[PDB]
Amino acid sequence: QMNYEEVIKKYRGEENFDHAAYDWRLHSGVTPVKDQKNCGSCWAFSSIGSVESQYAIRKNKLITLSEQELVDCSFKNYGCNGGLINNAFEDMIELGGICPDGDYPYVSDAPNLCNIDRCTEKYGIKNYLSVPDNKLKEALRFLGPISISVAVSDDFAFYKEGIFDGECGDQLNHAVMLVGFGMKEIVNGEKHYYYIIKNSWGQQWGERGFINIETDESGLMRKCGLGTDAFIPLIE
Numbered sequence: 001q002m003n004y005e006e007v008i009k010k011y012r013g014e015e016n017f018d019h020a021a022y023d024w025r026l027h028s029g030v031t032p033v034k035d036q037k038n039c040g041s042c043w044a045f046s047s048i049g050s051v052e053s054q055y056a057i058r059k060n061k062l063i064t065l066s067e068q069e070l071v072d073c074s075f076k077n078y079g080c081n082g083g084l085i086n087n088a089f090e091d092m093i094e095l096g097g098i099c100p101d102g103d104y105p106y107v108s109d110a111p112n113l114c115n116i117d118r119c120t121e122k123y124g125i126k127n128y129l130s131v132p133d134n135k136l137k138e139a140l141r142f143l144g145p146i147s148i149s150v151a152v153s154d155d156f157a158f159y160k161e162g163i164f165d166g167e168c169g170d171q172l173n174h175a176v177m178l179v180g181f182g183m184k185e186i187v188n189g190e191k192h193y194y195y196i197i198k199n200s201w202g203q204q205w206g207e208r209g210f211i212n213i214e215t216d217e218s219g220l221m222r223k224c225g226l227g228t229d230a231f232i233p234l235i236e
């Protein structure tokens with residue numbers, strides 16, 4: 001399954017890198033948010049996001065791929081009744097690529113039947129690695145956006161702009177992407193550090209789909225278990 005410490009060194013080597021801000025959105029590494037509507041398929045969106053990013057980052061190609069197919073075909077998961085990020089990545093490999101949603105469009109909880117050969121060209125992930133929770137900003141900076149868990153709550157839903165510092169979920173309950181991190185200074189001077197999350201609740205939600213959760217310079221601070229689970233697909 002490839003351990004992180006051997007993967008990380010091939011893509012970093014050295015730098016040294018800045019822990020204040022890096023935003024993939026701004027450097028052609030995050031494809032637009034989507035909306036899972038009603039249909040418990042975050043795991044599907046969180047997973048396929050990270051792969052869309054890698055095709056963006058590591059080979060130019062903008063491609064958006066079908067989380068429906070993944071909802072229809074990932075038998076290590078439970079379609080709209082839930083799923084897991086890893087399981088998803090594995091199911092992708094067994095399926096041997098995913099269709100570009102443009103061919104295999106999303107119909108949320110509307111009953112649908114898997115159809116592998118619904119698109120001549122598929123899009124694969126070679127393998128996937130876990131990112132350790134103590135090394136997220138490091139991972140983002142060199143490896144790319146990260147499919148990750150988080151304990152979402154009501155306060156989290158009413159987010160609209162700025163740095164979230166509200167209340168947290170009961171348990172890890174939702175999937176999202178990490179796409180970056182940043183820091184703004186606001187004088188009461190006080191440097192305020194945050195991670196940028198991409199969500200799957202439509203662009204109407206928060207900052208065109210995204211949300212900024214408070215953190216620290218290191219990025220050891222993880223609000224709402226931010227990435228107690230953390231995976232990134234390798235397509236290289």
Ligand SMILES: *[C@@H](C(=O)O)[C@H](O)C(=O)N[C@@H](CC(C)C)C(=O)NCCCCNC(N)=[NH2+]
Binds near residue numbers: 036042083084174
């Ligand atoms: C995520 C969402 O759309 O909110 C979706 O409910 C989901 O899959 N959530 C995960 C939470 C993790 C932190 C990603 C989840 O609950 N996974 C386990 C579901 C599998 C077991 N459930 C059933 N019904 N077999």
